[PDB]
Amino acid sequence: SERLEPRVEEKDGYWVLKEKFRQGINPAEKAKIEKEPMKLFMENGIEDLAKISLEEIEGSKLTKDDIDVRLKWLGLFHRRKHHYGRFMMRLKLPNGVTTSSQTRYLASVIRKYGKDGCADVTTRQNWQIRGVVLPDVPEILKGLDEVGLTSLQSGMDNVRNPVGNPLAGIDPHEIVDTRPYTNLLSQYVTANFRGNPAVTNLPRKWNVCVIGSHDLYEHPQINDLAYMPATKDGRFGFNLLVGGFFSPKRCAEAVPLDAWVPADDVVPVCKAILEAYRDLGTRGNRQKTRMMWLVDELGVEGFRAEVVKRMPQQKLDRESTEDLVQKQWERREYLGVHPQKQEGYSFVGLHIPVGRVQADDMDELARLADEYGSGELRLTVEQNIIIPNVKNSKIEALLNEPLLKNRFSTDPPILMKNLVACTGNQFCGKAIIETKARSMKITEEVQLLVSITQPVRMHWTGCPNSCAQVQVADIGFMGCLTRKEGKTVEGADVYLGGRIGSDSHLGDVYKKSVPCEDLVPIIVDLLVDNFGAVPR
């Protein structure tokens, strides 16, 4: 069979598209062919690239592709359009678990760039830092490694940050601690921080998550692979869901693979699915390359059969009938102070306004973690931060800290609690609109106008990529250009009725291309009409 012949092959320890499969391939594919991105790290190609001047780099397609494309395999994103010559940098941070000494190291990096530095918590409970310049990269990379961090394979056609339960290990109601799994996935994916070329040539990005909570903080429905906790014949394992994605062209919720694996087949099955997708995924139209297109093209039974054959021992159990997720569970709030599983300890959830932090904030967060916590922080997919492991006797002193007074509140105004916003055009070259500052301003004006009790989830995304996941929001805003009074302005498509949890739903467009200046009255009506709000 032509179709089921692997499109890529091992060639000198990297994985390259065969000469017979070059028909109709997209620009990303061409770039990957012209040079294996992983050589930048694995043959220390970065050390040489970091010395070439910026305009020497710009003079050739190969080196300009190195900086604009291949460097994303090392977690480095050139902000060509909004931050020319500087790089955002993005980690692996499985489960969102960071240390105070990681957080201090990142602060020391972004501090070098003064006002060209800052950082962000992301919608995959991850750190990004900003302001990085190419000559600093080899030392930054060494410095990440010293504090137990990697930035490998965090952008482009790679396995993205493994998402788990932000309360793993400390949650009194958790189903299973997700940390050992998200950690093993990340370790497998980066070959213990060395780089793993076997999984670095996918037809597109690939999101993985491990569910350990009844709340489904992990968003299984919108991941390429979701691991759902489930017993089979008295053994603990996971039912598998595949193909969930957001793109400008199409969104899909994850579907059952009709498969169950035992606890220690988590890595083997990740491997088998990744390998099936690598080998078989389409590499033409870039907008038909997400794994769900393969699942549709072969059918799920057809895709499933390709997973079986790449399993050790050719075996993949059928789905277990009854999973461990309580179908009727009210999602818990984690902002504020909450009892932990461990007696006499609490976790404290801090509101990070649209996930943006400065060097000083980071150093302060790291100190508060040491002084009051266990030197650990838990990042969340709503772009917030929890300090876990606070002895109850220390809470009151923590509560008085200027950081919690002036920047990161345990008790933000209702509408701010759950406000999520993607990078936007401050730095994102693909953005049509400014998100972070504007969303805060519009929400501040909105709350001044309403009494509301329900903690409405509001998501602001800068373009149709939907990195801020507007299709799961109660009200979502997707950046577009529109017309005001003849002038071309920043506007938004307004989404309604996305749901998260067990009864999840993708919302659809409520109103098209609304000028952003006209958003407040529309949002108030939407709050008043759908979410229990009472006017002025």
Binding residues are 79, 122-124, 126, 128, 130, 204-205, 207, 246, 287, 290, 383, 422-423, 428, 463, 467, 469
**Interaction between residue 383 and K ion (CB under 5 A):** yes
- Candidate segments 172-180, 272-280, 295-303, 426-434, binder of ligand SRM by CB under 6 A: 426-434
- Is residue 245 part of the contact set for ligand SRM (CB under 6 A)? yes
Question: 458: which strand partners?
Answer: 419, 475
Distance (Å, rounded) from C-alpha 228 to C-alpha 4? Answer: 28
CA angle 184, 185, 187 (to 5 degrees): 60
Q: Residue 323 has which token pair?
A: 């999973």
92 binds ligand SRM (CB under 6 A): no
Residue 81 interacting entry, from Cl ion, K ion, ligand SF4, none, C-beta within 5 to 8 Å by type? Cl ion
| Minimum distance, C-beta of residue 138 to Cl ion, in the bound complex (Å) | 22
Q: Which is nearer to ligand SRM, 425 or 482 (CB)?
A: 425
Please report whether residue 384 would count as binding ligand SRM according to CB under 6 A: no
CB of 112 to ligand SF4, least distance (A): 24
Instruction: Select from 419, 431, 506, 519 the one that contacts ligand SF4 (CB under 6 A).
Output: 431
User: Strand 14-17 and strand 8-11: pairing?
Assistant: antiparallel
Residue where the block lists tokens 């793109």: 247
Q: Does 207 bind ligand SRM (CB under 6 A)?
A: yes
Q: Which residue has the tokens 């780089």?
A: 195
Residue 473 Cα to chain centre, angstroms: 16
Q: If contact means CB under 5 to 8 A according to the sort of partner, which of K ion, Cl ion, ligand SRM, none does residue 284 touch?
A: none
Residues that bind Cl ion (CB under 5 A): 80-81, 155-156, 429
Would you say 210 or 357 has its CB closer to K ion?
357
User: Residue 497: which residues within 8 A CB-CB, separation 6 or more?
Assistant: 474, 505, 507, 508, 530
Q: Is 128 in the site for ligand SRM (CB under 6 A)?
A: yes
Specify the stretch interacting with ligand SF4 by CB under 6 A; choose among 104-112, 157-165, 373-381, 427-435: 427-435
Q: How many residues does the chain have?
A: 536
Which one of 111, 112, 286, 430 is in contact with ligand SF4 (CB under 6 A)? 430
- Shortest CB 156 distance to Cl ion, Å: 4
Q: Say which entry of ligand SF4, K ion, ligand SRM, none residue 462 contacts (CB below 5 to 8 A, set by partner kind).
A: ligand SF4
**Among Cl ion, ligand SF4, ligand SRM, none, what binds residue 463 when CB lies within 5 to 8 Å by partner kind?**
ligand SF4
**Of the residues 102, 150, 384, 423, which one makes contact with ligand SF4 according to CB under 6 A:** 423
Residue, CB closest to Cl ion: 429
Three-class SS of residue 294?
Answer: helix
Q: CA separation (Å) from 27 to 32, 50, 81, 205? A: 9, 24, 19, 15
Beta strands 419-421; 127-132: pairing state: unpaired
Q: Tokens 């150093």 map to which residue?
A: 363
244, 256 in Cβ contact below 8 A?
Answer: no
List 232's β-bridge partners, or say none: 235
Question: Which of 244, 268, 462, 491 touches ligand SF4 (CB under 6 A)?
Answer: 462
Residues in contact with 355: Cβ distance below 8 Å, sequence separation at least 6, in sequence order: 120, 121, 122, 383, 384, 420, 421, 436
Question: Around Cβ 321, how many Cβ atoms within 10 Å?
Answer: 10
What is the nearest approach in angstroms of ligand SRM to the Cβ of residue 486?
A: 31
Residue 367 makes contact with ligand SF4 by CB under 6 A: no
Rounded to 10 deg, the angle between the 179-190 and 266-280 helix axes is: 40
Grouping H, G, I as helix, E, B as strand and the rest as coil, residue 245 is strand
Query: Does residue 467 interact with ligand SF4 by CB under 6 A?
Result: yes
Residue 519 contacts residue 495 (beta carbons within 8 Å): no
Residues that bind ligand SF4 (CB under 6 A): 422-424, 428, 430-431, 461-463, 465-467
Q: Residue numbers of the site for ligand SRM (CB under 6 A)?
A: 77, 88, 90, 122-124, 126, 128, 154-155, 160-161, 204-205, 207, 222, 245-248, 290, 422-423, 427-430, 465-467, 469
